[PDB]
Amino acid sequence: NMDVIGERIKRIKEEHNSTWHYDDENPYKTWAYHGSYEVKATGSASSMINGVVKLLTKPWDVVPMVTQMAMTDTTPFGQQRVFKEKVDTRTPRPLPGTRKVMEITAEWLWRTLGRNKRPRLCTREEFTKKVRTNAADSAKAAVEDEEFWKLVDRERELHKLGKCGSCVYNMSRAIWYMWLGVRYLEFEALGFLNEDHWFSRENSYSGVEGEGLHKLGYILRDISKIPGGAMYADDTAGWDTRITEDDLHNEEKIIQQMDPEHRQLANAIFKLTYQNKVVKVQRPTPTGTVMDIISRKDQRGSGQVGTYGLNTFTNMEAQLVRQMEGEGVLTKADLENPHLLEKKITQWLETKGVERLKRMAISGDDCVVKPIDDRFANALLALNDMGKVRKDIPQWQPSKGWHDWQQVPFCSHHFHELIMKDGRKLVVPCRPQDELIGRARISQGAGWSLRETACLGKAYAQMWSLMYFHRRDLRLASNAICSAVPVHWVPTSRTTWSIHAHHQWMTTEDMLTVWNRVWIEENPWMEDKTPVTTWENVPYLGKREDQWCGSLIGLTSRATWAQNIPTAIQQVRSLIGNEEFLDYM
Ligand SMILES: COc1cc(C)c(C(=O)NS(C)(=O)=O)cc1-c1ccc(C#CCO)s1
Ligand SMILES: [Zn+2]
Ligand SMILES: [Zn+2]
């Protein structure tokens, strides 16, 4: 193993030869531990609170989920316990018949995914444009420095030789340049999966990449029209820790479709940074804080360019295998059999594969599957054996599916079908309201002025006006925030890092105009393009559904908040100062 990871550990060991030691009280059980060095502790035990959002959501000061969200421990202590609880495990090797079906399905799926698209290298200028559009950080400064690109070039020359010197995953500007450089090289070799939308629904059938939260419910409703059994949406317990050596070798098959110069760099990423990895994690000790240097051959590195796409790929494969078991194509005897008949798998993929992909909505580890019947509920042999054990349910207990697409969980949301006052139907995204309020009350970092805090508050308010307008409390709080924040101040930072977010709320354009563009003009499931001219015609969930999804409507404290909200708005305005404000109430 040292022939692939040895150089990286050697450079770390040499840079910290003063404090480098082999701490034999290290807690690693499934990861190879190489050594430790002294570091300055980073992170926080609590998240910073957005005062503008907090002042305008007084009834949620007394809400447990809202309080919990504001916690989140990122200190070496928090790092260590998350590591222990999840990441320090070993997934049993799938059986030989299971490995054979996975291999056949992976080959077929990669061929299907690359039927129209050809892989390509991503560039310095693409990465630069992405970093700049995200910053609008020291990454924009690094990208502007020529010396960063020279370090990138030197690392790439090692990769071309089948060597790695500085690509270390993290759980001086040199170590920052080496981190950003590692990320650029991964983007260079595997970025095409995202940049050329390989997991778009048109290209992958099951995929939803590029679709947007506002489209996911409509796609779930379209899946519900397909004849078959219930809709299943099982959660995997820590998916990234369940990515096996066999999954990694199956994902690597995409290199067969690459040009020689591309294949060489992508092979370097796979072999040196995915199938082998050097990881840095902080750990508190009685003497202070230390950085541990660890390594392993499997699992997925969560904060990587290829993670979403490769998790989507492996989940599509795993769900097709489960569909085959449900249909009787794969038996218990087949999974144990190294010599299992490849022909029946090939025949099922070639005749039914695409139709079975159309029965799914897959986004990374998130899946919704509508099998041909309910035999799928009990088809658990391959799923458990591939290592994709379902979260909080005994291993052999049948899955529970839904016969209403509106009850189906997907991507931390569920979706409602609303009837507008004019008779038109809308499909809207929704989640427990406490989660929406709790998240909006969290500020992103310390040393933030009232202006930056208010502008992030406005971003949350405008996201609610666009995606969660159907929640009575959120429309009211959104109107309150936008009345409290100067009209000409541009929303800043980001409300989410979700791939399903297109950030149409990041504007000073009228929110009703943005609402019409997204929900009416651009909406392919909205045949009638008649605009909505007033928010009074922008619908709400039925009051009982709003309440079932966490609304405080009907409570006295909520009525008291709604009545007194001009007072709280005025208090925010007075502390912001003499600026131009508008009355949205
Ligand atoms: C599936 O969508 C999401 C999934 C998750 C888990 C989270 C989240 O909680 N993010 S977080 C941890 O607060 O950063 C956020 C969203 C989105 C919010 C708004 C969106 C939009 C749009 C249309 O353009 S998409
Ligand atoms: Zn490297
Ligand atoms: Zn709901």
Distance of alpha carbon 217 from alpha carbon 223, whole angstroms:
10
Task: Name the token pair of 368.
Answer: 């919704």
Cα(58)–Cα(558) distance, rounded to whole angstroms? 9
| Cα distances (angstroms) measured from residue 451 to each of 213, 493, 573 | 28, 12, 11
Which H or E run includes 294? strand 288-296
Handedness of CA 346, 262, 148, 167 (dihedral sign): positive
For 583, the token pair is 């009355």
The three-state secondary structure class of 565 is helix
Strands 414-419, 288-296: pairing is: unpaired
User: 463 C-alpha vs ligand 1 centroid, how far in Å?
Assistant: 10
Comparing CA positions, the residue from 480, 506, 469, 534 lying closest to residue 214 is 469
40-69 b/e (C-beta count within 10 Å ≥ 16 → b): eeeeeeebbebbbbbbbbebbeebeebeeb
Instruction: Give 55's Cβ-side CA count (13 Å radius).
Output: 21
3-state SS track over 305-344: CCHHHHHHHHHHHHHHHHHHHHCCCCCHHHHHCCCCCHHH
Indicate the resolution in Å: 2.0
**Domain boundaries in the chain?**
1-40+76-89+165-171+275-297, 41-75+412-585, 90-121+191-274+298-411, 122-164+172-190
Q: How far apart are CA 233 and CA 107, in angstroms?
A: 25
Amino acid at 196: D
* Residue 432, CA distances (Å) to 21, 65, 66, 178 in order: 48, 10, 11, 40
- The answer to whether 213 and 436 are in contact (CB under 8 A) is no
Ligand nearest to the CA of 505: 1
Structure solved via: X-ray
- C-alpha of residue 323 to centroid of ligand 3, in Å: 29
**How far is 253 from 109, CA to CA, in rounded Å?**
10
> Which of these, 40, 319, 270, 56, lies nearest to 164 by C-alpha position?
270
Q: Do residues 282 and 39 make contact, with C-beta atoms less than 8 angstroms apart?
A: yes
User: Coil, helix or strand for 480?
Assistant: helix
Query: Which residue, 179, 189, 168, is CA-closest to 126?
Result: 189
Kindly state if the Cβ of 436 falls inside 6 Å of ligand 1: no
Q: Going by C-beta distance under 8 Å and a sequence separation of 6 or more, which residues neighbour residue 195?
A: 122, 126
Which residue's alpha carbon is nearest to atom 22 within ligand 1?
A: 501
Give the single-character DSSP code of 35.
Answer: E
Q: From ligand 2's centre to the CA of 364, what distance in Å?
A: 25
- Please compute Rg for the chain using Cα positions: 26
Q: Residues 415, 418, 420, CA angle at the centre, nearest 5°? A: 150
What is the topology classification, in CATH, of domain 1-40+76-89+165-171+275-297? Alpha-Beta Plaits (3.30.70)
Distance CA 459, CA 447 (A): 19
Closest-CA residue, ligand 1 atom 19, reads 501
45 CB-near residues (< 8 Å, 6+ apart): 71, 73, 74, 75, 77, 78
> How far apart (Å, rounded) are the C-alpha atoms in residues 435 and 66?
7
Cα separation values, 469 from 213, 443, 518, 537, 569, Å: 14, 22, 13, 11, 20
Supply 532's token pair.
Answer: 């909505």
Is the beta carbon of 569 within 6 A of some atom in ligand 1? no
Provide the Cα torsion 107, 108, 112, 113; round to 10°.
-40
Cα–Cα distance for residue pair 260/454, rounded to 1 Å: 51
Both tokens of 370, joined, read 């509508």
| DSSP-derived secondary structure for 496-524 | ---TT---TTSSSS-HHHHHHIIIIIS-T
Under DSSP, the state recorded for 48 is P
What residues sit around ligand 3, an ion, with C-beta below 5 angstroms? 430, 549
Query: How do the residues of the chain divide into helix, strand and coil, expressed in percent and rounded to 5?
Result: 50, 10, 40
Which residue's CA is minimally distant from atom 20 of ligand 1?
Answer: 501
Q: At what angle do helices 472-484 and 450-467 cross, to 10 degrees?
A: 150
| Residues in the chain, total | 585
